[PDB]
Amino acid sequence: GHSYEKYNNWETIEAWTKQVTSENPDLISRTAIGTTFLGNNIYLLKVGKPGPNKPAIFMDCGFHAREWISHAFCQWFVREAVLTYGYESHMTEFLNKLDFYVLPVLNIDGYIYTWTKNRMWRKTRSTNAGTTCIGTDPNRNFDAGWCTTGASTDPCDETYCGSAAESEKETKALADFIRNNLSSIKAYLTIHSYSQMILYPYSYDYKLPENNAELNNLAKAAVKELATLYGTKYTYGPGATTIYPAAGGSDDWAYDQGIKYSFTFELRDKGRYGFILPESQIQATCEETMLAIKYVTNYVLGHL
Amino acid sequence: XIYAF
Ligand SMILES: [Zn+2]
DSSP states (O other): OOOTOOOOHHHHHHHEEEEEHOOTTTTTEEEEEEEEETTTTEEEEEEOOOOOOEEEEEEEEEESTTTTTHHHHHHHHHHHHHHHEEEEEHHHHHHHHHEEEEEOOOOHHHHHHHTTTTOOOOOOOOOOOTTOOOOOOGGGGGGSSSSSSSHHHHTTTBBBSSTTTTTHHHHHHHHHHHHHHTEEEEEEEEEESSSSSSEOSSSSOOOOOOTTTHHHHHHHHHHHHHHHHHOOEEEEEHHHHHTOOOOHHHHHHHHHOHHHHHHHHEESOSSSTSOOGGGGGGHHHHHHHHHHHHHHHHHHTOOO | OOOOO
């Protein structure tokens, strides 16, 4: 069955999205924002106490198939939201004043594949013209300096940027949903591993966002809150100089749509286990990440 | 998450 303490396969995660919404209709509603290449449903959980014209924070997990602690965290977040609402004053104020759009797994097809065939798969599972090589890197497929740097035009590479921007059903679906909801989404958070980083734009170029100083201080403060629990050390900064130049990412794209608070989160660890983080580390990773997420939420709330 | 950075 489903556990928050273990990695769950897609069948279990899908059944969980229905069940947790079913058990908490007062705090959660579910939709799909599109389907994947292989016809799976890209679910989105709207977490919050329903009200007219509320602002929102958008968070996705599972961009990259093999980064399983990412998927894990979205599920953890949702449970913590429903558990502490009415019991922990901050989360209670958060759910009352805004919504969280939580997209638990974006790249469902790749995720299934990491379970069925290849644990180290990263990309989507779509076919490509002129080759047998499979998949596009969803985080190289967004219309942000698309395919100009840090991406590959070779479908056989794990940073393949796609035949065109948003060529992928999954990424077009995410981009469509965000455009269509631009006026309410105030922050964009996308969960990855591993590196222990909080990154903001830009990555597709060395330029800096006009609110660079704000973004940097918020990341700084977030990294601090995160450390308070277990002393886990994160680093922070513009993607381009903080890890590497890479075009077509969703964080940069979201920011250029006008969402001023845009962050990629790289969770545990720093390489000892890498993508194959032991399940015994799930709870600790998620707990400390919550503090960073909640700090940002609080900040966004006082800067509407 | 690109290998091997
Ligand atoms: Zn990643």
